[PDB]
Amino acid sequence: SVPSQKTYQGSYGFRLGFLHSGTAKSVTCTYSPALNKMFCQLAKTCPVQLWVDSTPPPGTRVRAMAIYKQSQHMTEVVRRCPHHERCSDSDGLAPPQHLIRVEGNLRVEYLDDRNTFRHSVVVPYEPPEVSDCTTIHYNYMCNSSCMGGMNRRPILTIITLEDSSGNLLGRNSFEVRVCACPGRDRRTEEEN
Ligand SMILES: [Zn+2]
């Protein structure tokens, strides 16, 4: 029962956007258009923008979930390695084992699916400020190079728009690499 990563703009014209931050060594995180891939540092702000043509009704919710990009690992639940799971980095909201967190939103909700056992993080959809997009600050809490976790396996992040009853309103996804030097890693992967 692998989660769907099928792009779906829906009735509200939903798509994702990212800062055009470039690849200087100083960048905290940077998105590659060519690769549809976000490069970011562990536990650092990772802005992700929601763009809609029409405002979804309040009660709309925004869910993030990670899956493995390769089919051979797709049925395996992306979670934190034992080290980071036992790590003393709680924010008091997120479960220890969850890879993805939302920073700066006290209304954040976390889910361990009772059936799939997959982890996800969800927030109320808010329209853009009086701004053309809604920004959510995500934090990835394990490295792509973590021993015992992602284990250098590539992951996808799936962002889903859903109504208050859980019904699908839209979906987009991007690949994610959590690394020490996003700028350098992005530039290196785009070399070829
Ligand atoms: Zn880890």
mmCIF file with all atom_site columns, N, CA and C and ligand atoms in Angstrom, residues 42 80-81 83-84 141-143 146-147 149, ligand 1:
data_model
loop_
_atom_site.group_PDB
_atom_site.id
_atom_site.type_symbol
_atom_site.label_atom_id
_atom_site.label_alt_id
_atom_site.label_comp_id
_atom_site.label_asym_id
_atom_site.label_entity_id
_atom_site.label_seq_id
_atom_site.pdbx_PDB_ins_code
_atom_site.Cartn_x
_atom_site.Cartn_y
_atom_site.Cartn_z
_atom_site.occupancy
_atom_site.B_iso_or_equiv
_atom_site.pdbx_formal_charge
_atom_site.auth_seq_id
_atom_site.auth_comp_id
_atom_site.auth_asym_id
_atom_site.auth_atom_id
_atom_site.pdbx_PDB_model_num
ATOM   1  N  N  . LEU A 1 42  ? 20.109 19.267 8.161  1.00 0.00 ? 42  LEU A N  1
ATOM   2  C  CA . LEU A 1 42  ? 19.345 18.690 9.259  1.00 0.00 ? 42  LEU A CA 1
ATOM   3  C  C  . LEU A 1 42  ? 18.863 19.774 10.224 1.00 0.00 ? 42  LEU A C  1
ATOM   4  N  N  . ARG A 1 80  ? 13.254 8.009  11.408 1.00 0.00 ? 80  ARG A N  1
ATOM   5  C  CA . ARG A 1 80  ? 14.584 8.385  11.864 1.00 0.00 ? 80  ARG A CA 1
ATOM   6  C  C  . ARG A 1 80  ? 15.380 7.159  12.315 1.00 0.00 ? 80  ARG A C  1
ATOM   7  N  N  . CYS A 1 81  ? 16.696 7.237  12.140 1.00 0.00 ? 81  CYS A N  1
ATOM   8  C  CA . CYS A 1 81  ? 17.611 6.203  12.610 1.00 0.00 ? 81  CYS A CA 1
ATOM   9  C  C  . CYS A 1 81  ? 17.531 6.121  14.135 1.00 0.00 ? 81  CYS A C  1
ATOM   10 N  N  . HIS A 1 83  ? 19.754 6.508  16.359 1.00 0.00 ? 83  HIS A N  1
ATOM   11 C  CA . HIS A 1 83  ? 20.505 7.599  16.983 1.00 0.00 ? 83  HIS A CA 1
ATOM   12 C  C  . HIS A 1 83  ? 19.673 8.858  17.122 1.00 0.00 ? 83  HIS A C  1
ATOM   13 N  N  . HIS A 1 84  ? 19.075 9.298  16.020 1.00 0.00 ? 84  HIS A N  1
ATOM   14 C  CA . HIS A 1 84  ? 18.255 10.501 16.061 1.00 0.00 ? 84  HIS A CA 1
ATOM   15 C  C  . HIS A 1 84  ? 16.932 10.238 16.782 1.00 0.00 ? 84  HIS A C  1
ATOM   16 N  N  . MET A 1 141 ? 14.824 15.906 10.177 1.00 0.00 ? 141 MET A N  1
ATOM   17 C  CA . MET A 1 141 ? 15.499 15.644 11.443 1.00 0.00 ? 141 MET A CA 1
ATOM   18 C  C  . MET A 1 141 ? 16.402 14.416 11.421 1.00 0.00 ? 141 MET A C  1
ATOM   19 N  N  . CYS A 1 142 ? 16.815 14.024 10.223 1.00 0.00 ? 142 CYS A N  1
ATOM   20 C  CA . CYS A 1 142 ? 17.741 12.926 10.014 1.00 0.00 ? 142 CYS A CA 1
ATOM   21 C  C  . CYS A 1 142 ? 18.503 13.299 8.745  1.00 0.00 ? 142 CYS A C  1
ATOM   22 N  N  . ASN A 1 143 ? 19.768 12.891 8.656  1.00 0.00 ? 143 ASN A N  1
ATOM   23 C  CA . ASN A 1 143 ? 20.602 13.111 7.472  1.00 0.00 ? 143 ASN A CA 1
ATOM   24 C  C  . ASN A 1 143 ? 20.350 12.028 6.429  1.00 0.00 ? 143 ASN A C  1
ATOM   25 N  N  . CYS A 1 146 ? 22.559 9.236  7.317  1.00 0.00 ? 146 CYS A N  1
ATOM   26 C  CA . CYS A 1 146 ? 22.435 8.622  8.628  1.00 0.00 ? 146 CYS A CA 1
ATOM   27 C  C  . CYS A 1 146 ? 22.518 7.109  8.551  1.00 0.00 ? 146 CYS A C  1
ATOM   28 N  N  . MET A 1 147 ? 23.405 6.548  9.366  1.00 0.00 ? 147 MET A N  1
ATOM   29 C  CA . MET A 1 147 ? 23.519 5.109  9.489  1.00 0.00 ? 147 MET A CA 1
ATOM   30 C  C  . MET A 1 147 ? 22.322 4.647  10.299 1.00 0.00 ? 147 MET A C  1
ATOM   31 N  N  . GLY A 1 149 ? 19.113 4.670  9.323  1.00 0.00 ? 149 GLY A N  1
ATOM   32 C  CA . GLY A 1 149 ? 17.863 5.326  9.014  1.00 0.00 ? 149 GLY A CA 1
ATOM   33 C  C  . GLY A 1 149 ? 17.596 5.279  7.529  1.00 0.00 ? 149 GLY A C  1
HETATM 34 ZN ZN . ZN  B 2 .   ? 19.687 10.058 11.769 1.00 0.00 ? 1   ZN  B ZN 1
#
